[PDB]
A paper describes a structure:
DotIC crystallized in two distinct forms (Form I and Form II) under different conditions. The structure model of Form I (space group: P21212) was refined to a resolution of 2.2 Å with the working R and the free R factor of 19.1% and 23.5%, respectively, and Form II (space group: I432) to a resolution of 3.5 Å with the working R and the free R factor of 17.9% and 21.6%, respectively. Form I and Form II contain eight and four molecules in its asymmetric unit, respectively, and the structures of these molecules are almost identical. The octameric rings are also present in the Form II crystal. The oligomerization of DotIC is also observed in solution. Although DotIC is in a monomeric state during purification, an oligomeric peak appears in size exclusion chromatography under the crystallization condition. SEC-MALS measurement showed that the apparent molecular weight of the oligomer is 263 kDa, which is consistent with the molecular weight of the stack of two octameric rings. This evidence suggests that octameric ring formation is not a crystal packing artifact, but instead an intrinsic property of the DotIC molecule.
DotI is a 23 kDa inner membrane protein essential for intracellular growth of L. pneumophila within mammalian and protozoan cells. DotI has one transmembrane domain in its N-terminal region, followed by a periplasmic domain13. DotI is conserved in all of the identified type IVB secretion systems, including the conjugation systems of R64 and related plasmids. Structural analysis of the periplasmic domains of DotI and its R64 ortholog TraM demonstrated that DotI and TraM are structural homologs of the T4ASS protein VirB8.
Author numbering: 73 to 207
The structure:
Amino acid sequence: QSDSAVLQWANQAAIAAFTYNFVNYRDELQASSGFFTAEGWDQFLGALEQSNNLDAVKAKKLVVSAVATRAPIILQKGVLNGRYSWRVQMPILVTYQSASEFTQQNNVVTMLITRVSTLNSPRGIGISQFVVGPA
């Protein structure tokens, strides 16, 4: 598990979460579940639920897409609760658009990636915590 291996793996992860539309959101959602640890997935869902973004896309029939504003960094790394973790951070530009609309947001995604058995996640690592903020 390289630091760069985790960084990129964390790069796809973030962008994937903001790549879906009102037509396929269920496939896209469920697809990116491998990216997450057992609880990181529960956390990610709970966060989705609380946000409306999804209801917005479904309602206004939008196509979400995102791109990395800057390169992802590792704020801190090392053992957290007997599991080696990386706290990766990266800004993105989300683009909620349709035939009628076109919005953009500047977001900062922060993920806690930890090590996990390859018997459940062939990669070896997983997002234990996915957290979005503005600017």
